[PDB]
Amino acid sequence: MKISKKQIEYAIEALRANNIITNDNQYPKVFKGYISSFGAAVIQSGLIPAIIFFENEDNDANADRHKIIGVLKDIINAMRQQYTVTDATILVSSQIPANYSMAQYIIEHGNTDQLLKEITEAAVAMKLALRMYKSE
Amino acid sequence: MKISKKQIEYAIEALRANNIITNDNQYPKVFKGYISSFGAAVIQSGLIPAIIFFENEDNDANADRHKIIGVLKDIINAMRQQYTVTDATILVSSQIPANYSMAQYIIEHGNTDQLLKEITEAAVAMKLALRMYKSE
Amino acid sequence: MNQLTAILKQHTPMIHFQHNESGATLRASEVKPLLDKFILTKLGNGDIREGRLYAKKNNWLIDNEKNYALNYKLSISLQKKSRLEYLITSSTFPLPTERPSNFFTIQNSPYFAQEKCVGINTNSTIILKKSNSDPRKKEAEFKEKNWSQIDKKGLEWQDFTIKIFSLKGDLINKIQTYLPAFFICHNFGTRNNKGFGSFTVEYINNQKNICNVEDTLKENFAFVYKKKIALSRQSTLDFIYIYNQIFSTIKKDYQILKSGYNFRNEYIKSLLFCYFVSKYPNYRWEKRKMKQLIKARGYELKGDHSPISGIRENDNSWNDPNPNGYNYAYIRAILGLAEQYEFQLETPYQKAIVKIKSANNCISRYKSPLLFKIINNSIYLVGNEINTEILNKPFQYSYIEQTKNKNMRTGKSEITERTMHINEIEMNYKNRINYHYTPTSFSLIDFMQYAMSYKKNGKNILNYIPLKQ
Amino acid sequence: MPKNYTLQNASNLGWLFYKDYYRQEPNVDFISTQGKESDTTADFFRKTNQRITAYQLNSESPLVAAFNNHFGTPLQLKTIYPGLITGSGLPHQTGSKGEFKLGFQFDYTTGLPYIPGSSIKGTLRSMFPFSLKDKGSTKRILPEYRKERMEYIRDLIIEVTNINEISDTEIQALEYAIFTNSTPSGKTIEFSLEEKDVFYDAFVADSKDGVMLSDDYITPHGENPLKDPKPILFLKIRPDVTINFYFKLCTTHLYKEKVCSSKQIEEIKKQNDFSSSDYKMITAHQKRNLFEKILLCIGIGAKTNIGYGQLKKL
RNA sequence: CGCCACUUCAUGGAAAUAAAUCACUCACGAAUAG
């Protein structure tokens, strides 16, 4: 496992797009813990349980916790955008619909290893990209 | 990777400049491990993840681990100076702005081959120059 | 010393959700937080913040910035595993003839949950059955599995151990000082405020504990009220009979407090009602508030006498209050928030239901601000002041009509959701005291200065000896 | 499959609890907000929890017998009823109703509930004086911590072994030899392979007449006493369950204030200068007694301040 | 005495931190020259 600079760029763009990094290049402190907990849940419980937990918006948490799932979808979409025709025959290169539920997308597409690898890549990229910024 | 004396002097000046060596020629003992581990992190994780890890200032580290990234930038900038400027030279003798963090610079300027070589040599110079001082 | 090994006595049975283990005893999950709160309150001489600073200075806190927790280890273990298991309901039913020795029934109790386990349902612990000699006087049968699958049991055990461990000696000394007061002041369990939590500590570190219950109650509570219940002979036999008398008396008195008693033939008005209609005579019942609009359409409710107005006399008014108007607030919210009100329509065939919600989803709960402490068969009623956060907060009332049908090939189906279309009084029908907005200017301390002083012939309705008031 | 967890007919408890727990059935929804609170999801999780808490362990179980053969004789203790909780912080929740919201520690290969040896080591060391590092955020707590722990461990040592006098330096050396297998000041001691304290993984050994796992509730009533509390469901080890504690402990020799190995202590004894007032010994049996007393005092697991994971002798 | 329920189902914190970053030995040996 080695995270590419392109993945970090996608993570930065997605964090800015789903209103996580402010215009002052700062983020709420709880999102680092959110991302670490998501990684731990993914490895321990599974993709479906972790994505279902962090896709919730009725959660009374201290911040908009679904934003990391939105950033995940944005990173995966950007990754699938740069897929080659050689890759498109083996990998599912389709862009994940924006309104579509990420957990529902995973479930309807089985539980393929491709989605798990993409989720793990994007989670580590989110971790590093958040580490690049300051936490106020 | 032979010892480059000029890079050693650059490392000495940068270590003094980024408040690592005290007025009495001593440094926090943990910085030895920081310098030693940075090269391994670059080799076996990637340059961007290693820089992001060592540039973070929200760390639970015994000292200011981010000072080594500033020293690295100072050594790299000193090497960009005294570059033989000619039409055929591959090396970009453009100095890294102080306002830009090191992680952003490699992200925005996507010619990592020069940056990787410079960062590796600067880290070797760092480790070799840290040995002139007391390991308190 | 670094260890505290106390032996404590059980006075009233504990309702325990995890009763399926023979080792079921007091849960330290209730004791430790409440004991920490009590200890810090005593440290600050009545103030929790000052006690927190005290524990902060002496390094007794697990965390010095976030929480109230103190650094010690709580362990509660049973010495002898024999348990006396009780069934706790709200009504009185015929006792079974075949019955395990551990099983006793406290039928008339404040704890009204799990009332359906003494029904005719096949899931009822004691299945009721018609009698053959008399087509009345229901028969009782015991189902072992149903008693095993009950959610909550009332348990009484012998003397058991509470062990307190800490490496901080001064905290242990202060715990030794304050533990008898803590147990004399707090109850643990479900519906513990009504008395299913009563414990006293006998031996602290193999030393008898001479701690006066009256003095500790006087210290830690705003008002303490003693009632000498007539222990008709016995006192050496039938602790079950003693429990039945004690809890029937508690149900009697607490139903007297915030409601009436339309039972057999004797009527005594709600003292919670009588307080508000007397002090600034504008605030009236939420029940009479509710019954007014049900009769606004044709829906005749069972009963012979109209809803009460006025403090006294035998007056009845199923009609307009007066030309000016009347003040309605949720009077019964302060003495325990309620959600759903059944109103008995004339025909059994259907019911009418009123359901209450915060109207902004803020106040979903209120534990009764009264605590019932029973120590060595003596009844003490205690309490601090109410939480002012409940005062002046609105509520939204849902009006539904529910009906049941008699079998027809499947069974009972109490399912009609017609959702009564009563016209609404409107939020802010007056200044924000109309139908909601729990009454302003209440005082619990003066409420019981008022509650047990009432009625003709001079005898107290709640024959309580005022100890602290 | 039903009771009597065996290598032949039984589902892996960890697999059931973590992998098969959140499986997607044709008519079960826990993605949408309606699905998580619906009674269909509650029934699904109730069936899963029944399957989890429907397993027993026999005394003569081949798994536990293999554990005994591999790890030497066990130290058998019993569970009090808060229950026993380990690995509570592991991520296990989706926001659904009727599901276990807390993590549990399951052995991967066997599926039997267990306490990792790291937990045993940390719990045992936590009551030794030098379990706290100086750092600089510890500075204020460090003096008092060491004092109380020194007194406690001193009384325990005088209780368990036939030594009438111990010192702070001797306690420091004993603790560092037991846990770090080194000296308090860095450098190591030439210890034999046998002379090394190993803390194996404690295992569930006997659920006598009932299952080994139960379901329990912690209901944190909020800081606002006027709002609705949160019922939290988790999985605990049942009371009256035999937990086997496996250790590989040796005999510790203390001459003067320093820890000596057997090879050094033989030569020290044979030296013409010797002092029985300076030579102290803690037998592996007395070390096991000390560890057992510590475990009885403080217990093991999570929520131990609430009481979870306390033991008596079997 | 007769009847009867509705509620609530995870948040906050820690997300790695220090030690060792190569060490020792060999760094040319013979033959051919004189």
Cα distances (angstroms) measured from residue C102 to each of C85, C463, D307: 6, 33, 28
Identify whether the C-beta of residue C202 lies closer than 8 Å to the C-beta of residue C179: no
Q: Tokens 């999570």 label which residue?
A: D302
Nucleotide closest in space to C342 (CA vs C1'): E4
Interface test with B, best of A8, A9, A26 (most B CBs within 10 A): A8
Amino acid at D242: T
**Which residue gives the smallest C-alpha to C1' distance to E14?**
A33
Cβ distance D103 to A44 less than 8 Å, yes or no, reads yes
Partners of C350 in beta bridges: C403
Cβ distance A40 to D103 less than 8 Å, yes or no, reads no
Cα distances (angstroms) measured from residue C274 to each of B99, C20, C264, C469, D91: 74, 45, 22, 20, 54
The Cβ of residue C92 has, within 10 Å, a number of other Cβ atoms equal to: 13
Nearest CB to B52 within list A2, A9, A132: A132
Identify whether the C-beta of residue A42 lies closer than 8 Å to the C-beta of residue A119: yes
CA separation for the pair D56, B13 (Å, rounded): 69
- Cα C262–Cα C264–Cα C268 angle in degrees, nearest 5: 40
Residues of chain C with C-beta less than 8 angstroms from the C-beta of D239? 21, 23
Beta strands in C194-268 (DSSP E): 199-203, 223-227
Put simply, whether C74 touches D (Cβ < 8 Å) is: yes
Separation between the CA of D176 and the C1’ of E15 (whole angstroms): 28
Q: H/E element holding D285?
A: helix D284-298
Separation between the CA of D171 and the C1’ of E4 (whole angstroms): 67
Separation between the CA of A33 and the C1’ of E14 (whole angstroms): 10
Separation between the CA of B1 and the C1’ of E30 (whole angstroms): 35
CA separation for the pair D274, D251 (Å, rounded): 20
Identify whether the C-beta of residue D105 lies closer than 8 Å to the C-beta of residue D275: no
Cβ distance B104 to A132 less than 8 Å, yes or no, reads yes
CA separation for the pair A125, B25 (Å, rounded): 39
Residues of chain A with C-beta less than 8 angstroms from the C-beta of B56? 131-132
| Torsion angle of C-alpha atoms B117, B121, B127, B132, degrees rounded to 10 | -160
**Which residue gives the smallest C-alpha to C1' distance to E19?**
B33
Cβ distance C389 to D226 less than 8 Å, yes or no, reads yes
DSSP state of C428: T
Partners of C343 in beta bridges: C352
| Distance of residue C83 Cα from the nearest chain D Cα, in angstroms | 15
Q: Which residues of D216-245 are buried (b: 16+ CB within 10 A; e: fewer)?
A: bebeeeeeeebeeeeeebbbbbbbbbbbbb
CA separation for the pair D123, D179 (Å, rounded): 12
Cα distances (angstroms) measured from residue B112 to each of B68, B79, C85, C177, D48: 19, 16, 76, 70, 52
Burial zone of C385 (CB within 10 Å; 0-12 exposed, 13-18 middle, 19+ buried): middle
Put simply, whether B61 touches A (Cβ < 8 Å) is: no
User: CB under 8 Å, gap of 24 or more: what pairs does D166-169 form?
Assistant: D166/D280, D167/D257, D168/D129, D169/D257
Residues of chain C with C-beta less than 8 angstroms from the C-beta of D227? 362-365
Partners of D200 in beta bridges: none
Q: Which residues of D touch A (CB under 8 A)?
A: 18-19, 21-22, 24, 30-31, 33, 90-95, 103
Identify whether the C-beta of residue C162 lies closer than 8 Å to the C-beta of residue C175: no
Farthest CA pair distance, chain D: 84
DSSP secondary structure letters along D203-264: EEEEE-SS-SEEEEEE----SSTTS----EEEEEEPSSEEEEE-EE---EEEETTEEE-HHH
Residues of chain A with C-beta less than 8 angstroms from the C-beta of D93? 49, 53
Please name the method used to determine this structure. Answer: cryo-EM
| Distance of residue C63 Cα from the nearest chain D Cα, in angstroms | 12
Separation between the CA of A53 and the C1’ of E19 (whole angstroms): 40
Strands C160-165 and C3-10: antiparallel
State residue C304 phi and psi, 5-degree precision. Answer: -105, -20
Nearest CB to A52 within list D90, D91, D95: D95
Separation between the CA of C404 and the C1’ of E6 (whole angstroms): 18
Residues of chain B with C-beta less than 8 angstroms from the C-beta of A135? 58
Q: Tokens 């306002």 label which residue?
A: B99
